[PDB]
Amino acid sequence: YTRTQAQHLFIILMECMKKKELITVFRMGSEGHQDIDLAILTALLKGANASAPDQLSLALAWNRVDIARSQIFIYGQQWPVGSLEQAMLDALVLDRVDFVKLLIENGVSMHRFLTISRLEELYNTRHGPSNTLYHLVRDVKKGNLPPDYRISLIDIGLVIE
């Protein structure tokens, strides 16, 4: 295939095999990861060499619940304190029902998570699909509203009434 044994690519080949922690091989029925789409995504989580919260954030961004279920949520992960709470808040803002269910099943409790400030933050999000809450808040509290306005829980009570 090359210029006989006189010319070889063995130096670069052995350097690559020295850095073989990142190589992923996809074989039909021989090794694991029989799905190539799983082979690509699982290589990205370990290839980033980041913590569990960063892997969970990446899986949340990709909207792949099974990837986080089979890889991120395993035995002995040692989440930092206050990380699952932030993951739950991010999943709640981005409208990820499957991740909310998975985080609920894996330890987090809604009674301690929900505070007044967190609910205020939830009511003033920009992610997710469109909604008509701003028009209702404008219609309730007088004819005029400032542009850069934070919607307080009093306004939500007024619009509910």
Q: Which is nearer to another protein, 100 or 140 (CB)?
A: 100
Q: Which is nearer to another protein, 26 or 79 (CB)?
A: 79
Q: How far is the CB of 138 from another protein (least distance, A)?
A: 38
Q: Which is nearer to another protein, 78 or 144 (CB)?
A: 78
Q: How far is the CB of 131 from another protein (least distance, A)?
A: 27
- Could you give the C-alpha distances from 43 to 37, 40, 73, 136, in angstroms and in order? 10, 5, 16, 47
Q: Which is nearer to another protein, 101 or 150 (CB)?
A: 101
DSSP-assigned letter for residue 1: -
The Cβ of residue 88 has, within 10 Å, a number of other Cβ atoms equal to: 22
DSSP character string of 105-146? HTT--HHHH--HHHHHHHTT---SS--SHHHHHHHHS-S---
Q: Over the range 37-60, which residues count as b (16 or more CB within 10 Å of their CB) and which as e? A: ebbebbeebeeeeeebbebbbbbb
Q: How far is the CB of 78 from another protein (least distance, A)?
A: 5
Q: How far is the CB of 119 from another protein (least distance, A)?
A: 19
* Closest C-alpha to 113, from 151, 84, 150, 93: 84
Q: How far is the CB of 144 from another protein (least distance, A)?
A: 44
Q: Which is nearer to another protein, 111 or 126 (CB)?
A: 111
Binding site for another protein (CB under 8 A): 75-76, 78, 101, 104-105, 107-109, 111
